[PDB]
C-alpha cells in the first residue's frame, strides 16, 4: 500500500500536481492530506508508471509532508531538483 | 441528450480522464471540445456509472467548457471543491 516514485526533471514536463494540505481546501472530504490530483498522459509522471491520481503524498525527497500545508509542500516540491523522490500511500 | 453527473473525489480522484480542448489536437474531427476519454475500472466515476467514454463535457460545476482550453478544464476538475457536477452531452 506504499510506493516510491522517482521522477527526473528534464525537457519534458512532470505532468502532475498535488492538492490538499493542512489549512487548505481538502482534496477529498474529511482528509487534509496531500494527494496527487492530476496526471497528464504525456508527462514524466505518467511515463514512469509509478504515480496514480489520488495517491497520498507522504514525503518529498525524504521530508515528511503528512501534515504539511499546501504551499509548504508545493515549495518543497519545487526545491526537489533535479530529482523528485515521493513516498506514496495507495488504497485497495 | 444531456445528463448531469455528480462525483466526489476519492481514492482514485474522480477516476476518469478528459481529452481535447481549445488549441489542442482535437479529440473528434473539427471539434476541440472537452470529452471523457477513459473511465478507470476503480474509483468514483466507475461506481457512479453516470459517465460514458465519449461524453462531451459541457460544463464543470456550472462553468461552461465548450470552448475551454484543456488546462482550464483540468483546473476546474482538480483545484476547486471535492464534489464535481458535470453537464454531459451524448450523441
Amino acid at each position: 500500500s506504499r510506493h516510491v516514485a522517482c521522477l527526473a526533471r528534464s525537457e519534458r514536463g512532470l505532468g502532475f500536481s498535488i492538492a490538499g494540505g493542512k489549512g487548505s481546501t481538502p482534496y477529498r472530504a474529511g482528509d487534509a492530506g496531500i494527494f496527487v490530483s492530476r496526471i497528464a498522459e504525456g508527462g514524466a509522471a505518467h511515463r514512469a508508471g509509478t504515480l496514480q491520481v489520488g495517491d497520498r503524498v507522504l514525503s518529498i525527497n525524504g521530508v515528511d509532508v503528512t501534515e504539511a500545508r499546501h504551499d509548504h509542500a508545493v515549495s518543497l516540491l519545487t526545491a526537489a531538483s533535479p530529482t523528485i523522490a515521493l513516498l506514496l500511500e495507495r488504497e485497495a | 441528450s444531456r445528463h448531469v453527473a455528480c462525483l466526489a473525489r476519492s481514492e482514485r480522484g474522480l477516476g476518469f480522464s478528459i481529452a481535447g480542448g481549445k488549441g489542442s489536437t482535437p479529440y473528434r474531427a473539427g471539434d476541440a471540445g472537452i470529452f471523457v476519454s477513459r473511465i478507470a475500472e476503480g474509483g468514483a466515476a466507475h461506481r457512479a456509472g453516470t459517465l460514458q467514454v465519449g461524453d462531451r463535457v459541457l460544463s464543470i460545476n456550472g462553468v461552461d467548457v465548450t470552448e475551454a482550453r484543456h488546462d482550464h478544464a483540468v483546473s476546474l476538475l482538480t483545484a476547486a471543491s471535492p464534489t464535481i457536477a458535470l453537464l454531459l452531452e451524448r450523441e
Binding site: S37, R38, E41, H46, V53 | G13, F16, I18, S37
Partner: peptide, 8 residues
C-alpha cells in the same frame, strides 16, 4: 498542436 489527455 498536441493531443492532451489528463487523468483526474
Amino acid at each position: 498542436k498536441h493531443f492532451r489527455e489528463t487523468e483526474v
